[PDB]
Design a binder for this molecule. Sequence first.
Ligand SMILES: *[C@@H]1O[C@H](CO)[C@@H](O)[C@H](O)[C@H]1NC(C)=O
Ligand SMILES: *[C@@H]1O[C@H](CO)[C@@H](O)[C@H](O)[C@H]1NC(C)=O
Ligand SMILES: *[C@@H]1O[C@H](CO)[C@@H](O)[C@H](O)[C@H]1NC(C)=O
Ligand SMILES: *[C@@H]1O[C@H](CO)[C@@H](O)[C@H](O)[C@H]1NC(C)=O
Ligand SMILES: *[C@@H]1O[C@H](CO)[C@@H](O)[C@H](O)[C@H]1NC(C)=O
Ligand SMILES: *[C@@H]1O[C@H](CO)[C@@H](O)[C@H](O)[C@H]1NC(C)=O
Lengths: 49, 266
Amino acid sequence: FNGLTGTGVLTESNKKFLPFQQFGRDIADTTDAVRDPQTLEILDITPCS
Amino acid sequence: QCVNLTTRTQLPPAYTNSFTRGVYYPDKVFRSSVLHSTQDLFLPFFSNVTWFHAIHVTKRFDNPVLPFNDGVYFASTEKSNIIRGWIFGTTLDSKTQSLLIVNNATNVVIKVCEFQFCNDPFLGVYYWMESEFRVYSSANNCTFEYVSQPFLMDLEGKQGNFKNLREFVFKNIDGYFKIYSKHTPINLVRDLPQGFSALEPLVDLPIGINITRFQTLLALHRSSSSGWTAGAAAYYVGYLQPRTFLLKYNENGTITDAVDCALDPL
Ligand SMILES: *[C@@H]1O[C@H](CO)[C@@H](O)[C@H](O)[C@H]1NC(C)=O
Ligand SMILES: *[C@@H]1O[C@H](CO)[C@@H](O)[C@H](O)[C@H]1NC(C)=O
Ligand SMILES: *[C@@H]1O[C@H](CO)[C@@H](O)[C@H](O)[C@H]1NC(C)=O
Ligand SMILES: *[C@@H]1O[C@H](CO)[C@@H](O)[C@H](O)[C@H]1NC(C)=O
Ligand SMILES: *[C@@H]1O[C@H](CO)[C@@H](O)[C@H](O)[C@H]1NC(C)=O
Ligand SMILES: *[C@@H]1O[C@H](CO)[C@@H](O)[C@H](O)[C@H]1NC(C)=O
């Protein structure tokens, strides 16, 4: 996603994600969400394994 | 045209306290139910800010050119379309670059395009259509012009007693140029109220100018050098400083409150 390389499962999420915010992060400063550039939908990332 | 509108009765020095205001969103990242510490150019809590009054109750056209330092907090909590834009330039006399920002409630004309500013550049609507447009003499060299207009960032339409609490933050760090902005309805009389407010980097424009000094463009009412009106202005200037702030994010991803880790031992 716009250079945000990573491995995991993308799932539709309920995160509010105010319009200016684009990435979203957890306490460990690891991106656990993204905004899809085509459609402005929030997909949280749950790692596999 | 460019007129020598003097109306200069030097106002006495005015100083007020900024309280817990002037704090913006550091990055475009959604954080929920966490506290984040960020080192950036913020307005120190309970700092001293300058309150120019461009009122006519006391005819004062308060348009001084003040330094930029590290960034400008501008709480233009005025009435309908009084202060419109801002000029950011080291010399602002067409010798060097001087980026001009004008909204005029309809468009957005951010242009580096070093202009020949004659004395005091200002806007104005004639007794109504906007008429005073000669803030300069010539465009000289017109660099990156940003001919796109997002929307009228002033967001006028509210009336009362300084009801439209409008706040802007101008930042120029190395490259780029950030303009954060928040609007809040408050009554009070003229001062900055209590509470916390911050909402998005309104407009980010990559310019890279020296931006050493700055000033503001003031709209007026043609009935001319003395026959005008000022309404009620709230010219507010605060200089940012590099501080560390501990911002708090609630569960729906908005900054609720923050602290400045340089004010008091607590
Ligand atoms: C980008 O184009 C696709 C079709 O190719 C469209 O579905 C999508 O909405 C577009 N994105 C934006 C932000 O306009
Ligand atoms: C500005 O306020 C500070 C406290 O915030 C005070 O120490 C200082 O003297 C004030 N300056 C002026 C010029 O009133
Ligand atoms: C934006 O609107 C103002 C209204 O005064 C007008 O003068 C200006 O030319 C407009 N900008 C463009 C690019 O048409
Ligand atoms: C204006 O810009 C042009 C184009 O980059 C440049 O060649 C010129 O030296 C600049 N200055 C003047 C005074 O024309
Ligand atoms: C231009 O920018 C430099 C670097 O920030 C600054 O120190 C300097 O004062 C500016 N130059 C002039 C001539 O004002
Ligand atoms: C919670 O998110 C909703 C989205 O509908 C929003 O209306 C509300 O203001 C948020 N809560 C807070 C405390 O900001």
